[model samples]
Target: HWGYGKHNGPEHWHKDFPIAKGERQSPVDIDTHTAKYDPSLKPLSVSYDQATSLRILNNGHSFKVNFDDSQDKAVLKGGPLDGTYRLTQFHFHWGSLDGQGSEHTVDKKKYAAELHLVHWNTKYGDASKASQQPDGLAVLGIFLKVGSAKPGLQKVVDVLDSIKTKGKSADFTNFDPRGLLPESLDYWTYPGSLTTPPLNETVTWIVLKEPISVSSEQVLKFRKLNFNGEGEPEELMVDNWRPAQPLKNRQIKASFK
Candidate 1:
């Protein structure tokens, strides 16, 4: 399995997953001044039923909140998308230290962490078939800054202790992900791939412009998680972010002026 360790980190991923060097790789640097504002882009429409949140799990890569996407219970529309995208899961990438773990950067500036809300295009019918198409996914990236503790994140934090080891899981429900987003809907869009292996170039990336606040103490809790399972030598699960990839010929579109 792939891991964020000195030996099997992102640098060596390409050896196994050849597509890691694909042209449209994710976590690219977003230069705001250089991004073109697209007046044609429609405002994002996000709707979520808190009860649709099913469970939380430590998937060895990062902790994620899975959703019941059997229907459009939690869905995203507009904002450079052709149709509605059903929310499947959401996860985070962070570092052991503050101000250095975000996968995507703004003008080369790294944040304390980054949140990814993964949604699959329902136009293709289901997530499995959608993953093979070019417009299969739409991942929303939100930057996290260290400041006051985010009350919206408390529910997520309270469960971290129980799932500290790799492969651990717990039932998580009734948490509305919208509470974690910034007030502004302003975002930058581009084409990219999954940061992890099977590095598929199927995502239409929507990275938020404004960052949400989190406390240093809260970030510290994320570092306590172990990359290894319960009887193995503990490896702190931090710095699980992929390095910024080349932008190539892709044009970044902004939803705001």
Candidate 2:
């Protein structure tokens, strides 16, 4: 019922999720000129050993590769964060076309897609508990542009076929997420919420200043994914992103000058 179609899309989310209209809602358009540079902001650090990824699944919204979070097998620290956070999962939001998929646009410039690496503050014990705290979640948002194929992304894209339908899953082991990161770590930091339903205002968004490249054809593969179940009407899962919400007087800090 809570999907991304006209009847249940983002516009209707506030009907069920009242926080959808909250002040710190995510995927806000990043006005670069208004973003302040904070020299005090720490550098971003993500450390994940081998055997990090466990499985990939299509959760009726978008497919995501899950990671083991029982321990700090994958951890995120620094970068406007006061404490360490554990990686839970990584997913993407994309468009049907190459022009308007990204959630956080720079000066109204939308990218081809956006990737989110979600983590929870360790002090809260679990992501569920953490979601109630302001500093509970830390999500790394990476913008994706259409260009040459990114080899690391190719590895992830190759598995999309196995989870073509909703609720499908496949083992995706021994993958290093570091392979998918861009060369630069500079980012824009803001206090925001989950872009999806439940819309918890607990996420600390760290959107990368740089974008990684992926071929247009490669992006088309994601379109093959279905939002409906095996027996339900087959609905494609394109345009799963939410539009940028109002900033509501919040400050957006940059990691660079």
Candidate 3:
């Protein structure tokens, strides 16, 4: 029922989702100059099993690759976390142009796109059940800059043709998601909610300081994917990103100085 448009987009979200007005809404701009560094924050850890990537689908909002979360084949821990979390899915948000698209920004600088690696705390069983708890989810937000092509992302983008319309899906296996991350693990983190609707304030947002690369030509293929179903009026799936929300009383903690 909701979509990213002037009528039903983010601004209208608060009407359907009251939590949109909550204190810790996500996609906050990280003021690097003011971001507090924490030596106590542990180094971020990530391990992924190549075979756990089961399929990819366009869920009417964004295209996502699903992971086998029944087991801890893909896990993330450390870096401001008190427990282990399992990989559930991975998705992207982008704009029609290269200048700006990312949800979170650094000192007001936006990237061409953003990648979200969604994880669910195993202590709460699964993503569905865990999403209501404050400590139940941890999302790794990686910004995408346009330059040369990232080979890791090429494989995922190649299949956009297979799922051009919303609700379309295909088998997408044997891909290691870690291949999409930058070499550095330095990050800025804070308590926040899902950038999209339902706006659950359950996630601990970890936004990476380093951005990965994507080619100008490669993102053109991303725009070909449709936000509508096969029979509906076609709408290009661009500008899927939500803008940075108010920081309010929250403080952003940097993992490195």
Candidate 4:
């Protein structure tokens, strides 16, 4: 039930979830100058089957596209990962206005929004158990910039009207997530945790260097979602992103020079 509100915002998350203050928390500020370029890093291998995309849901926190992970229909390999990671779901984080969202920042600069493609290591059997280990999850962070309308993203935006209320869900198949990615595969890798509650420190973060574009009108549909359920006072679902956490002694490895 935690939300981006004055009463139960990120500042107060630690009251119940102590890991919110953990050292390996996610959405850290990426200092490019400090990031080390590693020639040993392998190019990422991402193969997603559009048919594996099952449904989409408005979880109140954000709209999510769930994938069928029962098989390796969609998987991610290489690029700082220990083993093959199966795609599970993908979601977004945005603010009330443009240029203010994005959990991860680069050189202290914020983006319009951020997309999280969640995956779990196959070595751990399942995502639930994998989340407890250090190298259990691999999240791909793609930043969103305001520009011309993105044709690939329109399919996702078209469904927003039906899922305006919390808990609403609809069939969302035949959608390929790769279309949401930017031109470059360049990224920064680091050890971090989930941005939300429990904040498990098991993620191997792969944040893309280049950002993808989406029209301002498309971003507005994301704000139309409500955090509250039926019959409750409507609370706009905006700024659902966690602020950048302390980098501590973590070394960010860059895939490209």
Candidate 5:
């Protein structure tokens, strides 16, 4: 029922209420600079303390999830991260094609899609309180590129069949998010805003430099998402990548020694 009418496009999002224009914007390009890398920002090995849980949220759209912390220790411990953070939620942004699905770009090149691991710093006490503070949140970004077939991700795609309609969700248990990260833990760190509306400039972005590969078939399934649920299924939203923004006098550190 929710078709992407012209008026509903990104540019028109704030037509009815201009306030939306100030929302945090996403899909920015990331420029990699080998010269600016810092050895101190080494990537930390994180452990999945328990069998993960999954959930489908009905926030205007049916987004997928793997809820490890919600049922178990939700608290994520041990990382190069100076503070403790707990997993809140994770989601993806894709395009209508295999070549382009992610929201974050690197040097203007597109990837199949992007997975966001949303976590909040525990220094603020609890998840809810931590979410309100600008420095209280940390996002781990992983790039998904189309390559050889990967069976691990099937767990997520398999659930898509269930939430076929808008505003639908489901519960999935016993999954581990650790399997999703790339083997190379090297990453880029920067202080930036959330890639959505009210794009608050308080986030600590930890974007993985190496990308994980998914099969062509996996990429194709993403393109199956439709904006309006009509017109040849309107090519599922596959690559919802956001272009990288300016450093704006900000320093970008890396975890490569």
Candidate 6:
């Protein structure tokens, strides 16, 4: 009954969620016509320290990976005409079940997962501080569709066995996460707020239109981790995605045409 609990499900929290008022939210119904495809965002380059520290933090509701801001590079040239951004932090959002895990949708299709690679202007310095600045953050949204192949997510998933329970944490030693990125860096861009609390409206959302594939087994592992406390073990928080919101008058532009 976890998902059906009065105060636990999405339906119950929307009224109080911080970003609930925005016309646009994640899990968007991606419409191609509304998409200003700017094919210039091809072949991205991201550089991270080959030996970066990764930590898992379970804040009661779900698990998030906390890692040192690796000095990585993201090279995007061609359509938008060349530029590189440094990698900052990478995180994930999922649901309490497996069937529904995406934070954004394309024409009502919810994918198996979503990964966020957060970056910011190096001029502002460090991701933690830069993330607080108005123009300091840029995020690359990668969608994960369910399939049989593992699609090489070991950098994060391989450590899942260590932090599988509520409040459990582990230090994942020596791993480079850049391998998780999709080959195509071209992306859809927009101005929007953070999909979570303290929702800041300063993010330059760069969502990748092409989704990367991961095995259904891997997705199940994501849903099975423990998240309960105080009374009952919180049902594995699997597919906890927020529904898509209206775009209002905001424009969603892409780096490819």
Clashes in predicted model 3:
0
Q: Estimate TM-scores for all models.
A: 0.98, 0.98, 0.98, 0.97, 0.81, 0.80
Per model, state how many residue pairs clash. 0, 0, 0, 0, 39, 29
Where in model 1 is the C-alpha error above 4 Å? none
Q: Compared with the true structure, what per-residue lDDT tens digits does model 1 show for residues 1-257? A: 78888799898899999988888999899998999999999889877754288899998989999999988788889999998899999999998778799999999999999999999999899898998889999999999999999998989988999999999999998888988889888999999999998889999999999999999888888889988899999888999999899998899999987
The CA lDDT at 10 in model 2 is 94
Q: Model 4: which ten-residue window has the lowest total lDDT?
A: 43-52
Report the Cα lDDT for candidate 1.
Answer: 0.91
Relative to the true structure, how large is the alpha-carbon lDDT of every model?
A: 0.91, 0.92, 0.92, 0.91, 0.63, 0.63
- Cα-based RMSD of the predictions, in order? 1.0, 1.0, 0.9, 1.0, 3.8, 3.9
Tell how far residue 197 is off in model 2, in angstroms: 0.6
Model 5 residue 11 CA deviation in Å: 3.8
User: Residue 48: error of model 6 in Å?
Assistant: 3.6
| Candidate number with the higher TM-score (1 or 6) | 1
lDDT of 6 by residue, 165-245 (tens): 667778765555656667786677666656665455556677787888887677777776666643575566555556676
Question: What would the per-residue lDDT of candidate 2 be over residues 1-257, giving only the tens digit for each residue?
Answer: 89888889999999999999998999899999999999998778878664279999999999999888998788889989988899999999999999988999999999999999999999999989999999999999999999999888887899999999999999998888987789999999999999998999999999999999999878999888999888898889999999999999799999997
List runs of model 2 lying over 4 Å from the truth. none
- lDDT tens string, model 5, 1-257? 22233444445444553533343334456666532667655446455565456676533332657465543355443334676677777877766666675666777778878888877776777656765676777788898888876676888777766665445578867766777878887777666666654355556677788999888787676555443332334334433444455454556666765
lDDT of 4: 0.91
Those runs of model 6 whose alpha carbons end farther than 4 Å from true positions after fitting are 1-19, 23-27, 39-44, 49-51, 70-86, 95-99, 230-232
